Each structure stands twice: as structure tokens, then as C-alpha cells.
Amino acid sequence: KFPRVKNWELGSITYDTLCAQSQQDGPCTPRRCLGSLVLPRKLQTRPSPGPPPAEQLLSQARDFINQYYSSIKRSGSQAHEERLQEVEAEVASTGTYHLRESELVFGAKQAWRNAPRCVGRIQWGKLQVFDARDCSSAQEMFTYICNHIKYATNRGNLRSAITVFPQRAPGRGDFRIWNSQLVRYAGYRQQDGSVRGDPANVEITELCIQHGWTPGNGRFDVLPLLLQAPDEAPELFVLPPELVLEVPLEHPTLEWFAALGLRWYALPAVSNMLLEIGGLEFSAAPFSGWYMSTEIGTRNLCDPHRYNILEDVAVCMDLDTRTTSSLWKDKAAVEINLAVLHSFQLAKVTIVDHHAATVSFMKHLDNEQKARGGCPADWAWIVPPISGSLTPVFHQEMVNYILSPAFRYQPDPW
Amino acid sequence: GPKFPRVKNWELGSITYDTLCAQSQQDGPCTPRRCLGSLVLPRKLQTRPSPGPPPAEQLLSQARDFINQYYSSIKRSGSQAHEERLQEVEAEVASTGTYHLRESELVFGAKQAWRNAPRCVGRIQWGKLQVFDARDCSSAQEMFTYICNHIKYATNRGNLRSAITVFPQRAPGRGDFRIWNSQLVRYAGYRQQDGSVRGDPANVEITELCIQHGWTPGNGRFDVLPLLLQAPDEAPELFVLPPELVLEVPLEHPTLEWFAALGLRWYALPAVSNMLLEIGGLEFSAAPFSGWYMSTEIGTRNLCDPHRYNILEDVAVCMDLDTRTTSSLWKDKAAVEINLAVLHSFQLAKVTIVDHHAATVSFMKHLDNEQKARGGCPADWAWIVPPISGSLTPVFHQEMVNYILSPAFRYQPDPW
Ligand code: HEM
Ligand code: HEM
Numbered sequence: 001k002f003p004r005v006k007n008w009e010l011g012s013i014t015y016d017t018l019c020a021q022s023q024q025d026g027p028c029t030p031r032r033c034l035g036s037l038v039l040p041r042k043l044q045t046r047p048s049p050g051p052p053p054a055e056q057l058l059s060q061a062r063d064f065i066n067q068y069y070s071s072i073k074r075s076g077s078q079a080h081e082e083r084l085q086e087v088e089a090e091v092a093s094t095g096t097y098h099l100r101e102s103e104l105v106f107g108a109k110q111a112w113r114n115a116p117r118c119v120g121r122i123q124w125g126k127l128q129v130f131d132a133r134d135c136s137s138a139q140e141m142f143t144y145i146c147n148h149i150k151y152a153t154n155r156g157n158l159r160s161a162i163t164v165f166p167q168r169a170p171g172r173g174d175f176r177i178w179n180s181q182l183v184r185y186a187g188y189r190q191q192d193g194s195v196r197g198d199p200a201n202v203e204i205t206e207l208c209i210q211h212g213w214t215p216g217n218g219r220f221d222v223l224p225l226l227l228q229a230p231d232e233a234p235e236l237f238v239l240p241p242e243l244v245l246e247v248p249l250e251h252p253t254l255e256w257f258a259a260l261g262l263r264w265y266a267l268p269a270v271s272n273m274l275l276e277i278g279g280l281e282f283s284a285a286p287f288s289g290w291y292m293s294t295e296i297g298t299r300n301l302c303d304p305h306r307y308n309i310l311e312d313v314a315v316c317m318d319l320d321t322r323t324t325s326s327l328w329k330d331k332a333a334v335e336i337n338l339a340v341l342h343s344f345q346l347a348k349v350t351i352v353d354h355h356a357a358t359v360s361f362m363k364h365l366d367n368e369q370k371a372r373g374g375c376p377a378d379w380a381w382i383v384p385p386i387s388g389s390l391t392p393v394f395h396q397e398m399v400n401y402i403l404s405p406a407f408r409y410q411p412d413p414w
Numbered sequence: 415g416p417k418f419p420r421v422k423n424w425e426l427g428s429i430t431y432d433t434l435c436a437q438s439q440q441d442g443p444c445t446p447r448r449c450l451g452s453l454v455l456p457r458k459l460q461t462r463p464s465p466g467p468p469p470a471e472q473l474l475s476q477a478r479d480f481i482n483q484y485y486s487s488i489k490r491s492g493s494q495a496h497e498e499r500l501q502e503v504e505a506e507v508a509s510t511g512t513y514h515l516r517e518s519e520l521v522f523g524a525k526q527a528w529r530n531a532p533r534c535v536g537r538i539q540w541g542k543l544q545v546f547d548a549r550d551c552s553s554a555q556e557m558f559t560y561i562c563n564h565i566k567y568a569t570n571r572g573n574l575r576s577a578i579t580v581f582p583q584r585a586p587g588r589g590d591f592r593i594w595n596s597q598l599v600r601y602a603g604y605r606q607q608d609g610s611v612r613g614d615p616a617n618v619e620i621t622e623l624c625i626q627h628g629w630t631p632g633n634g635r636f637d638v639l640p641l642l643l644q645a646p647d648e649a650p651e652l653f654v655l656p657p658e659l660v661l662e663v664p665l666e667h668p669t670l671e672w673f674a675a676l677g678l679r680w681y682a683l684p685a686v687s688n689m690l691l692e693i694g695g696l697e698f699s700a701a702p703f704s705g706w707y708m709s710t711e712i713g714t715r716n717l718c719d720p721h722r723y724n725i726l727e728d729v730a731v732c733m734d735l736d737t738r739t740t741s742s743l744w745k746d747k748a749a750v751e752i753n754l755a756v757l758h759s760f761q762l763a764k765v766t767i768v769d770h771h772a773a774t775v776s777f778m779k780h781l782d783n784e785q786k787a788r789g790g791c792p793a794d795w796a797w798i799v800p801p802i803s804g805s806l807t808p809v810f811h812q813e814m815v816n817y818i819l820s821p822a823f824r825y826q827p828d829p830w
């Protein structure tokens with residue numbers, strides 16, 4: 001029942017008892033493991049055909065509230081009971097309820113803390129929670145989003161933050177941010193079928209053009225936002241260039257790298273995920289912290305289905321691109337990651353390398369082992385895309401399981 | 415649509431459905447509640463020493479299943495021969511309590527087992543395996559002769575050939591044939607006074623177990639351990655490998671002259687010798703196998719793991735890198751060069767080796783082949799993706815479904 005978890009570098013061992021609190025099922029079954037799959041369809045968050053059994057929501061809600069009060073140690077107090085009564089009251093009459101700002105702040109933090117795929121969870125306690133449930137239009141989301149970006153960026157000294165927009169309402173549309181991240185480079189499919197820019201953003205780039213945006217023709221054209229208000233066609237808003245901080249990329253000892261004119265934005269801000277707290281679902285809650293160098297240098301720039309600049313660089317490095325055994329890929333990958341780290345540090349913008357980052361995650365596991373008796377972690381996502389066993393987490397066994405509050409994936413609006 | 419795991423490759427955007435997992439008749443460690451897919455040894459395949467023969471009934475189902483597998487592999491499923499072999503196996507379990515495999519059935523099962531290994535990335539070669547039957551073997555001395563012939567044939571003076579040597583299956587009331595060593599060729603780990611370890615820290619226990627058994631220990635970092643071979647109900651005996659049989663490769667770098675000076679070296683033949691080979695229910699406690707190395711096994715795990723040779727620092731210093739700050743990627747840089755050194759050295763020494771790129775590319779080919787032949791392929795992602803340049807290989811972008819198929823290679827408790 002309670003997993004025996006071992007680290008193979010320190011022979012240490014623990015017993016994950018935190019998974020007992022998991023009330024949602026993953027994709028694995030005793031017959032076959034599907035832990036390496038990216039998406040579900042089973043862990044997904046289907047829209048609202050109607051009101052969910054008052055008993056269900058009520059239960060998720062009762063549990064969350066209990067969490068919040070244990071949180072502030074006032075468990076069993078009067079306020080705790082009066083708060084439960086409240087929630088049961090609202091639900092019984094309207095089929096739903098709402099959260100107090102202090103609970104939202106607690107929930108958002110627990111959601112990050114429970115994020116099995118996040119390696120930066122050691123920062124979970126420090127989170128700036130902008131409340132935007134007081135939003136009635138897309139015009140407004142744009143402003144809120146602009147405030148978040150402005151604050152989170154802080155001229156390079158990045159600060160973690162999340163902005164929570166109106167929870168989903170049964171029998172009503174959903175506030176939604178169509179973009180996958182608040183900031184992403186457009187992908188233009190040029191005749192040859194090939195792509196100019198970011199292949200990952202071909203679709204969202206299309207949709208934008210389809211709603212009026214007049215595209216550009218560059219490799220790094222910052223995409224406009226397509227904010228959607230309940231049951232209304234999305235609206236298009238361009239992001240103020242002064243607002244979008246970017247880091248030109250150059251290399252420490254290789255003068256030519258800069259020539260490549262590669263660049264990347266400073267704010268990683270996933271914006272299409274769903275935040276679920278006490279049964280409530282927040283369809284639009286963008287969050288941001290700061291990049292870990294490999295996300296840009298390894299996946300974004302070297303993925304074959306991304307900017308795939310791996311060969312262009314090896315050529316310049318005068319490498320033997322003829323055979324695999326020359327390790328021209330491994331050699332060029334490390335320089336590109338070095339270049340990202342170097343450039344961000346030079347532009348005085350927050351960034352964390354994969355070594356330092358996984359070290360902090362180890363500490364986090366420790367801190368969490370003591371605090372809750374375990375930590376849900378997705379091994380395949382926690383181990384960096386390069387130098388895996390070269391980091392401490394590669395050698396750490398992990399247990400994956402779903403806990404709430406939680407960030408979950410959700411279907412595309414279109 | 416389909417009632418089977420939907421699998422996607424995010425690089426090419428292609429989709430496949432795995433129907434082969436429905437053929438697994440043995441649960442793993444996961445549950446809808448939590449996934450334990452990153453655990454190295456969850457108690458599942460594990461075969462705690464059963465006092466006697468499997469439950470008369472249970473052993474029948476397993477056995478009847480393997481036979482079905484054999485006849486279908488030869489396209490004679492449902493034939494007179496197939497049905498008779500079935501009647502035969504049953505009768506033998508009904509009278510003796512166990513049963514034996516015809517030669518061709520053993521070769522078949524062995525290959526299946528490899529073919530089914532979820533953690534092996536070189537399975538594209540599963541059909542090409544030399545199976546030395548050695549079920550006649552009756553002594554620890556005899557065990558030593560077979561093993562030597564294996565290394566002789568498998569090493570083949572540089573041009574390695576995949577092979578496996580199968581010894582007598584577990585018998586009721588009779589001890590097992592066990593090879594105490596983890597691999598046929600291993601370097602000694604000497605426990606020091608100051609607490610450290612000279613050689614390979616992994617092999618410390620087996621090194622101390624050979625000494626207890628009269629081995630006269632040396633004192634270098636790369637000392638080839640002796641073999642602790644054990645026959646049924648006897649205590650193990652010791653045997654030393656003739657240096658001429660154990661091919662070894664000195665490591666040097668293609669452009670860094672000093673690397674050669676480090677005096678680093680590795681043996682060419684990898685041979686897991688402690689795994690259990692299970693076929694049709696029959697358990698072969700000793701059945702060493704070998705193929706050939708993949709660059710990263712040596713250049714990343716053995717040489718750079720903190721709990722192994724841990725040479726990352728020494729090499730980084732020699733390259734004049736900033737080891738006092740992770741953001742310099744001094745670890746990534748040195749690792750790349752150490753791996754390039756293992757590759758270079760083997761090539762230079764006409765010894766078979768495969769790098770992680772070619773290896774994983776060929777595995778993708780293997781997945782496509784199996785998709786067509788069996789409707790899928792059991793794979794352990796954490797083990798398939800190389801320890802360096804992970805997302806730079808095609809396997810990183812390929813989702814995988816892990817499950818247990820038999821024949822199989824299962825981990826087993828140390829004999830001691
Ligand atoms: C403090 C800086 C942070 C760092 C360094 C960090 C780093 C990471 C990295 C490396 C990933 C994998 C991303 C990928 O490969 O696509 C990840 C995933 C994730 N992080 Fe964090 N994170 C940070 C802050 C945050 C914050 C502020 C939140 C929310 C409050 C958050 C929520 C998540 C979630 C939900 C995922 C998975 C998203 C997905 O499945 O696409 N992270 N994080
Ligand atoms: C000829 C080329 C071969 C290559 C390049 C190859 C490579 C590999 C690699 C990289 C691993 C993981 C090593 C580790 O992480 O410690 C592995 C594991 C394994 N291979 Fe292969 N393999 C080959 C041949 C064989 C043969 C001939 C057999 C058996 C007949 C086999 C059976 C297995 C099994 C059982 C495992 C898992 C062992 C464990 O759990 O530690 N392999 N192979």
C-alpha cells in the first residue's frame with residue numbers, strides 16, 4: 001500500500017503515505033503502466049453539461065475547506081464550522097458556491113505544490129495571487145493580463161504569480177485564454193509546408209490571422225492574445241512591446257552564435273490549463289515563475305519539431321555532422337544551453353540551470369517528506385532533457401498521483 | 415475509439431494503439447491510484463524462492479500458454495502436433511510435477527524473453543541470438559567451462575555476437591544453479607579504511623563475498639572479479655577468468671591527449687548473469703546473456719555516476735572548467751567528452767559498440783516492426799531514454815506502454 005521509495009545514489013529510503021489522500025485516478029492499472037503518456041481523456045476536465053451532483057461538489061468543497069483551516073491551524077474552531085455551513089448553504093440553494101480571497105490564495109498555492117510535473121515547486125510558498133474573479137469582459141482580461149506580465153517580469157527580476165479569472169458557470173460559456181502561454185512566437189506555414197518561426201504555434205497563429213491579426217514574417221514575432229469571454233467570439237489584443245521582455249541570445253566564447261540572431265522571451269506563462277479548488281473550476285488562470293534553461297536551450301531550440309537549430313549550430317561549430325558517433329548533437333546542445341544561461345544572466349533576467357534546479361527539487365522532496373509524508377512527482381518530466389543521470393533526480397524513485405487543489409489540462413475552446 | 419492504450423509520438427505526431435498489453439497475464443506495480451513506474455525494483459516479477467513446484471494447476475496454465483506461443487510462432491497453432499505437445503506437457507506435470515522443453519522450444523522462449531524485455535533498447539536484434547543449451551551441466555566446474563566458451567564465442571575478438579547460456583531449471587527439493595556475480599565480467603570494489611572504495615563501488619558486496627570464499631584480492635580500480643558458481647545444494651566454488659578470454663579496452667580521447675593518461679579502461683562484454691529466465695512457467699535460475707554495449711552505459715553511468723567511478727570532476731579539472739558553479743555546465747561538457755572517449759576507444763580497438771543516437775533510432779524501427787507483428791511493444795521509458803541528451807534522441811518523444819509478457823527475464827533474490 002505505502003510505496004517504498006529509494007534513492008539509488010544515497011541508498012536512502014522512504015514510505016510515501018501522502019498518496020492515500022489521492023481521490024482521483026491516474027492512467028495506470030496493474031496490467032500496464034501508461035505513466036509516460038502526456039495527456040489523458042480520463043483525468044481531463046469535461047465541460048459542464050449541467051450541475052454536478054450537489055453531493056460531489058459539496059464533498060470536494062468540504063474537504064478543501066477542512067484543508068484551509070488545518071492550514072491556518074484554526075481547525076475545529078467556530079469560523080471553520082460557520083464557513084462549512086456557509087458553503088453547504090450556498091451549494092444547497094444555487095448548486096454551487098464561491099471562495100473567499102484568502103482561500104483562493106491557499107488553493108492556488110496548494111495547486112502548484114501538487115503539480116507532479118513541476119520541478120520548481122520549492123518556491124511554492126512564494127506566490128503573488130492576483131484576484132480577477134471581478135472580470136466581466138475580454139477587454140478586462142487583457143488589462144489584468146497586462147498587469148500580471150508587468151509585475152511578474154519586474155524588469156528581469158522575475159517574481160512568481162498567478163491570475164485567477166471567473167470560475168466556470170454551468171450552462172454558461174467559459175472565460176478562456178486561447179493562447180497556450182501568455183507569450184509565444186507565431187508559426188507561419190510557408191508553402192513548402194515547412195514553417196517559419198515556432199512550429200508549435202502554427203494553429204494558434206492561424207486562428208489569430210482568422211480573427212483579424214495581421215501577421216509578420218519573422219522567426220520570433222510575439223503573438224497577440226485571443227481572450228474569450230463567456231459565449232462570445234474571442235477578441236484580439238496586441239501586447240505592448242515595452243511590456244514583453246526578451247533576451248537576445250549570444251555565446252560566451254563563440255562570437256558567431258549571436259549572429260544567429262536567436263532570441264527568447266523571459267516570462268514562461270502557461271495560460272490554457274485549468275485550476276481546480278474545492279470542486280470549483282477556474283478555466284482561465286494563467287501562472288508564471290521563471291524559466292529553467294533547458295526548456296529554452298534544449299526543448300524549444302533543439303527539438304526537431306520546434307526551431308530545430310541543432311544542425312545549423314553544429315555546422316558553425318565545425319562539427320562532423322556525418323555520423324552520430326561524433327556526438328555533434330550532444331556537443332552543440334550543451335553550447336546552446338550554455339548560450340541561453342549566459343545571455344539571461346547578462347540581461348539580468350531570472351533563470352535557473354537544470355543542475356541547480358533539480359538540487360532544489362531534492363530539498364523540496366525532503367521538506368515535503370517531513371511535511372506531508374510524500375510528494376507526487378512525474379519522473380519523466382522532472383528529469384531534464386539533457387544530462388539526465390548527471391542530475392540528482394535521475395537517481396530518485398518517485399510516486400505519481402493526483403491531489404487537489406490541482407492544475408489539470410482542458411480541451412481547446414475552438 | 416479503440417479499447418486499448420492510445421500511444422502518440424510527439425515528434426512526428428503519429429498515433430498507434432497497443433493491443434499486445436491485453437496479452438499480459440501478470441500485474442505490475444501501478445494502480446489507478448498511483449503510478450510506481452519509476453521504481454527500479456517494485457516487488458512484482460520478483461520470484462521469492464518457492465519451496466517446491468508451482469501449484470499443479472497454475473504451472474499448467476503457464477505451460478499451456480507458452481506451448482500455444484511456440485506453435486503459433488511456427489504457424490502450426492491448432493495442429494495435431496500442437497495438441498499432442500499439449501497432452502504431453504500436462505501428463506508430465508501430472509506425474510512428475512514439472513516438465514521439460516524440446517530444444518527448439520528453448521531457443522524460441524529465450525528469444526521471446528529478450529523480445530519482451532521492457533528495459534532493453536537493443537531489441538531490434540532479438541531474432542539474432544546464439545542459444546547455447548547447457549541444461550546437461552552438472553557441476554560448478556562444468557558451469558565454468560560453458561561460461562568460458564560463451565565469452566569465447568560472444569567476444570569473438572572484437573566483433574561481438576549476442577548469446578545466452580541456459581543451465582538446469584529449478585527442480586523440486588533440489589538446489590538451484592546460481593551465478594552469484596551480477597555480471598560475468600565485473601571490476602572489484604575494495605572497501606577502504608578511510609571509508610572510501612577503490613574500484614567499482616557497485617561490486618563491493620560481491621567482492622567481499624569472493625574474498626570470504628578464498629579469493630586472493632588485488633588492489634587496483636579495475637580488477638576483474640572471479641566467478642562464484644554454484645551447483646544444486648552445494649556451496650559455491652570459485653573460478654578465475656583466463657585474462658586472455660576477458661577482452662578489455664583502454665580509454666583515450668580523439669583530441670585530448672591527457673585523457674589517455676587517466677588510465678581508464680573497460681571490458682568489452684556485458685553479461686547480466688543474475689537474472690532469472692522464465693519460460694512456460696519453468697524457471698532457469700542461471701542463464702547469462704550478453705550482446706554488446708551502448709556508449710552511454712559506460713561513458714555516463716559506470717564512469718560518471720556519483721556512486722560509481724564518479725570521474726566527472728577529475729575530467730572537468732583536466733579540461734580546465736569552472737567546477738565551482740553549476741551554470742557553467744562543466745558536468746555536461748565533461749560527460750560529453752567522456753562518452754566521446756568510450757566511443758572512440760572501442761572503434762579504435764575494433765570492438766562492437768553502439769552510441770545512444772543510433773541505438774535509439776534503431777529502437778524506433780523496432781517499435782514500428784513490433785507494432786505490425788504484435789500490435790505493440792512493452793517499453794520502460796525511464797530506461798529507454800539515454801542518461802544524456804535524452805530529448806535529442808527520438809525515443810524521448812515516443813510515448814510507451816509498460817507491461818509484463820512471458821517468457822521473461824525477472825530479477826531474483828541474491829542466492830546468499
Ligand atoms: C519558480 C519558478 C518555476 C520554475 C523554475 C518551474 C519550472 C517548471 C518546469 C521545468 C516545468 C516543465 C515545463 C515543460 O517542460 O513544459 C514545469 C511545469 C509545471 N509548473 Fe512549474 N515552475 C515554476 C513556477 C511555477 C508556478 C508559479 C506555477 C504555478 C503556480 C507552476 C506550475 C507548474 C505546472 C502546473 C506544471 C505542468 C504544466 C504542464 O503540464 O504543461 N510552476 N515547471
Ligand atoms: C546486442 C545489443 C544489445 C544492446 C545494445 C542492448 C542494450 C541494453 C541496454 C542499454 C540496457 C540497459 C542497461 C542498463 O541500464 O544497465 C539493456 C537492458 C536489458 N537487456 Fe539489452 N541489449 C542488447 C542485447 C541484449 C541481449 C542479447 C539480451 C538477452 C538475450 C538482453 C536483455 C536485456 C534485459 C533483460 C535487460 C534489462 C536488465 C535490467 O533490468 O537490468 N539485451 N539492454
Ligand SMILES: C[C@H](O)[C@H](O)[C@H]1CNc2nc(N)[nH]c(=O)c2N1
Pocket residue numbers: 036037038380381382424810811812813814
Ligand atoms: C512522450 C514523453 O512523455 C514526453 O516527450 C515527455 C517527456 N518528458 C518531459 N519532461 C518535461 N519537463 N516536459 C515535457 O514536455 C516532457 N515530455
Ligand SMILES: C[C@H](O)[C@H](O)[C@H]1CNc2nc(N)[nH]c(=O)c2N1
Pocket residue numbers: 008394395396397398452453454796797798
Ligand atoms: C530511480 C530511477 O528509476 C533509476 O535511476 C533508473 C532510471 N533510468 C534508467 N535507465 C537505464 N537504462 N538504466 C538505469 O539503471 C536507469 N535507472
Ligand SMILES: N=C(NCCC[C@H](N)C(=O)O)N[N+](=O)[O-]
Pocket residue numbers: 120181268269270287288289290291292295296300
Ligand atoms: N517554467 C515554467 N514553464 C512552463 C512551460 C514553459 C515551456 N516549457 C516553454 O515555453 O519552454 N513554468 N513557470 O515558471 O511558471
Ligand SMILES: N=C(NCCC[C@H](N)C(=O)O)N[N+](=O)[O-]
Pocket residue numbers: 597684685686703704705706707708711712715716
Ligand atoms: N548492453 C547490455 N547491458 C546490460 C547492462 C550492462 C550495465 N549497464 C553495464 O555493465 O554498464 N546488455 N547486453 O548487451 O547484453
Ligand SMILES: [Zn+2]
Pocket residue numbers: 028029032033034035444445448449450451
Ligand atoms: Zn504507471
